[PDB]
Amino acid sequence: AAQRAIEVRTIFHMIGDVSGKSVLDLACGFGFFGREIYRRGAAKVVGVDISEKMIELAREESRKYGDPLEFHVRDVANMEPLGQFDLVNAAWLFNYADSVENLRKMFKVVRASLKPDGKLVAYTVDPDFSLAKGNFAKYGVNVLNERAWGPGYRHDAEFVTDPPSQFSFYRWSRADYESAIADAGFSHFEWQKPLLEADDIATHPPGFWDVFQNNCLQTGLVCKP
């Protein structure tokens, strides 16, 4: 999966120095980002996922490496309050909101989870992605279709793995994201193009990254109270 290196680089560029910070890792899966955030010096990391199966995995991972991550099974859109943190990290949370209403609830939960000087770092589907402009299979995500779903779009996809793992997500428009951000009470936000570097260009055949730059499936997003 060639895209994961760039995603990790972009996320940690947005996060910056985590030393001594408290961190809430939303849609945490098995804990990849929260666990690495801790490795780089975070004071405290809490992970939340809606899947009991994923949290069971995430807890076994922390047992294997002996790290102090704490995990919770919760639906972020309807989340029991969990305190306030210096940093909320949300890699692949918002594209699982199945309605604009649910996207807006998620941004409100995030804002309630933030200290006044805190920040949200998020990775999500670029609203401008258009399936016709090029698939993302060569970067690790095979987008199979694109269907209108209310004011947004539904995509069925699969990770280019063995076996290829199927999943489904939602692409909400930039205007709906920015409305959810503003109405949740974030005074500032910035979209972050993924940090494709000269080193990436040099280590791949010419033009390998053209579709990635012309029709990126991913985007970063940083919001501050």
Ligand SMILES: Nc1ncnc2c1ncn2[C@@H]1O[C@H](CSCC[C@H](N)C(=O)O)[C@@H](O)[C@H]1O
């Ligand atoms: N409403 C919701 N609340 C919390 N977690 C959710 C959710 N909808 C989907 N998820 C979780 O979000 C995850 C997306 S996969 C991303 C996992 C991890 N952040 C990583 O980057 O590796 C899945 O584990 C899924 O269970």
